[PDB]
Design a protein around this ligand. Sequence first.
Ligand SMILES: CCCCCCC/C=C/CCCCCC(=O)OC[C@@H](O)CO
Ligand SMILES: CCCCCCC/C=C\CCCCCC(=O)OC[C@H](O)CO
Ligand SMILES: CCCCCCC/C=C\CCCCCC(=O)OC[C@H](O)CO
Ligand SMILES: CCCCCCC/C=C\CCCCCC(=O)OC[C@H](O)CO
Ligand SMILES: CCCCCCC/C=C\CCCCCC(=O)OC[C@H](O)CO
Ligand SMILES: CCCCCCC/C=C\CCCCCC(=O)OC[C@H](O)CO
Ligand SMILES: CCCCCCC/C=C\CCCCCC(=O)OC[C@H](O)CO
Ligand SMILES: CCCCCCC/C=C\CCCCCC(=O)OC[C@H](O)CO
Ligand SMILES: CCCCCCC/C=C\CCCCCC(=O)OC[C@H](O)CO
Ligand SMILES: CCCCCCC/C=C\CCCCCC(=O)OC[C@H](O)CO
Ligand SMILES: CCCCCCC/C=C\CCCCCC(=O)OC[C@H](O)CO
Ligand SMILES: CCCCCCC/C=C\CCCCCC(=O)OC[C@H](O)CO
Ligand code: NA
Length: 463
Amino acid sequence: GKTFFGQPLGLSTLFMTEMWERFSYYGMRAILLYYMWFLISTGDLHITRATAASIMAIYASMVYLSGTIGGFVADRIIGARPAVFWGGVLIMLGHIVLALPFGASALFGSIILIIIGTGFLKPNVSTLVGTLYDEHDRRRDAGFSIFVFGINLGAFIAPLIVGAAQEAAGYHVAFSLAAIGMFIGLLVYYFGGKKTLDPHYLRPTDPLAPEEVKPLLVKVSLAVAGFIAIIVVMNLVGWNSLPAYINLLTIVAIAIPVFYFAWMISSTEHLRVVSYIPLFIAAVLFWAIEEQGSVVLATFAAERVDSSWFPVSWFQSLNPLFIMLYTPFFAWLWTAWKKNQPSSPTKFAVGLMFAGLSFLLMAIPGALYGTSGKVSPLWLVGSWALVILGEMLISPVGLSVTTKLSQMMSMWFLSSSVGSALNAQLVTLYNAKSEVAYFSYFGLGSVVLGIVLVFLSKRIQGL
Ligand SMILES: CCCCCCC/C=C/CCCCCC(=O)OC[C@@H](O)CO
Ligand SMILES: CCCCCCC/C=C\CCCCCC(=O)OC[C@H](O)CO
Ligand SMILES: CCCCCCC/C=C\CCCCCC(=O)OC[C@H](O)CO
Ligand SMILES: CCCCCCC/C=C\CCCCCC(=O)OC[C@H](O)CO
Ligand SMILES: CCCCCCC/C=C\CCCCCC(=O)OC[C@H](O)CO
Ligand SMILES: CCCCCCC/C=C\CCCCCC(=O)OC[C@H](O)CO
Ligand SMILES: CCCCCCC/C=C\CCCCCC(=O)OC[C@H](O)CO
Ligand SMILES: CCCCCCC/C=C\CCCCCC(=O)OC[C@H](O)CO
Ligand SMILES: CCCCCCC/C=C\CCCCCC(=O)OC[C@H](O)CO
Ligand SMILES: CCCCCCC/C=C\CCCCCC(=O)OC[C@H](O)CO
Ligand SMILES: CCCCCCC/C=C\CCCCCC(=O)OC[C@H](O)CO
Ligand SMILES: CCCCCCC/C=C\CCCCCC(=O)OC[C@H](O)CO
Ligand code: NA
């Protein structure tokens, strides 16, 4: 009878929970770079714009990385439903910290809170969506598709609302709106959740057995002690600038999948794991380019686009806008394409090519008009139109192609973390002087690697 778009009613709760969480997150993302520019311009924040850009990327990287851990903590320690709640509380506090009358000094506290908060919430709202369905329920795919629509919806309206708020009432109010967004999500989640969510998920579904507590404790302790020792050594030898710490985080984010690889490849469907390397690298490079929209394209939008009549942060709405527009088309395409459907390796290859084209496109206005002037918003619209076209190919089959080849599964989600970590290095190269070369180089490079993957496509599809 009564459903939410054909799904169990409980989906409406999780849909809105995540919509408002994504609202809070992408509302923040859409103005945080500009906020750091502002803090720099007033002499409050003593970093370069390049470093500010690097912060944005490594921020995203750590958020993605944190998300690969929150599932474990919920499933084994605190439960999925408390994970989402307290995750949301931390996210909200993270935005509240930026709304307070502080400047640069509040940035780190905010970043940590949201990293931890999102890590708790993001994987576990997804988990709770699954719990709405029996094993044999054919609606599961549809329900997640609707769930993802809620994600994109929140990502879409946030830059519009928060960005406008920022320009009208300043950054603190804008960040307060992101906080309020999360609060709304928490209200709907908490009271909505009590009614439709299985009480089972108030507790861990796979709680630590007695003999598991100490080994986990030792693991975490060694990791923290090791990380801290590195920071001590870094400060002793004078590698203690912010870019230095960002490099450390870059190294950590990249080393984690490198080590899982070295593990699996060393430890015979070995051949299959080897086949994932080009797919994973393709995913990483795609996510790198896609995640640069909130950094390099946001920079381009503010410095190089004639946007005198609307908030420049609004460009951040194009990414989720195009996902939502493309989605029913690609949904149709993959069912209608019965004969000769492309392989997932081919989708990755073509997906990366489109990402490459999105940057190659952005090289044109600077090459044609020079970089001193300002250009139409349509250049960015076209760029996002292209990279999202790439996303429609890689994103829906990403988890899929990885699975058909638990550690390796997290690596799919890690590819975006690695992509953002790569960005933390790359985006420091972007400026007005390097603009055309930046877009050309990384655009062409991605296309070439898309072509390389096309050549490799047949091998991979057999394994
Ligand atoms: C399902 C079909 C996929 C097709 C969607 C991909 C759309 C790609 C568009 C890229 C071209 C955008 C460049 C437009 C542009 O820069 O014009 C600026 C100039 O006209 C200033 O007025
Ligand atoms: C639980 C795994 C997730 C990884 C957690 C580690 C995250 C640690 C630090 C976040 C790094 C953010 C760097 C940006 C940053 O420091 O900006 C602060 C400004 O420099 C303030 O002066
Ligand atoms: C630090 C200020 C934040 C204060 C948070 C509110 C504290 C009041 C009650 C604690 C709420 C604990 C509920 C945890 C939880 O699992 O919520 C899930 C709901 O049952 C819906 O699934
Ligand atoms: C129960 C948790 C509360 C969740 C709501 C958090 C946000 C609520 C109020 C914050 C709004 C006021 C902060 C913005 C502000 O004061 O601006 C300061 C001046 O405009 C200086 O720029
Ligand atoms: C950075 C996140 C990585 C995972 C964090 C784990 C938290 C640190 C150490 C593990 C402590 C877990 C508490 C054990 C617990 O509460 O349950 C005990 C068992 O359920 C009873 O046998
Ligand atoms: C600040 C990070 C430090 C890194 C190590 C984190 C250690 C944090 C908490 C250790 C929790 C102690 C484990 C024992 C425990 O909680 O189990 C109790 C049982 O559930 C009672 O039967
Ligand atoms: C459960 C609490 C988690 C505590 C945070 C864990 C990660 C802490 C630090 C990661 C390293 C990032 C340091 C960034 C930073 O502020 O350094 C900038 C310095 O001012 C260098 O001039
Ligand atoms: C899953 C295992 C994780 C492995 C982490 C190993 C990280 C060990 C050392 C990282 C070195 C720290 C980087 C510091 C650095 O690059 O300095 C930056 C500049 O040269 C100083 O301005
Ligand atoms: C009416 C379009 C459907 C709703 C779009 C949502 C708004 C999200 C981003 C729009 C901000 C950047 C677009 C600006 C634009 O396209 O203007 C083109 C004109 O030629 C300006 O010279
Ligand atoms: C459903 C139609 C889909 C068409 C999408 C394919 C787009 C093909 C080429 C993109 C054009 C490259 C940028 C446009 C360009 O260079 O012209 C320069 C500006 O028009 C100068 O005013
Ligand atoms: C299907 C739509 C295709 C849209 C993207 C197609 C763009 C293809 C090639 C654009 C590459 C632009 C090169 C610009 C360039 O590097 O010239 C340098 C000039 O000397 C200015 O520094
Ligand atoms: C400017 C001179 C160099 C220009 C290089 C252009 C050649 C680049 C790519 C050739 C792509 C040919 C497509 C054939 C191909 O990839 O086969 C697909 C595989 O058989 C499927 O795995
Ligand atoms: Na503007």
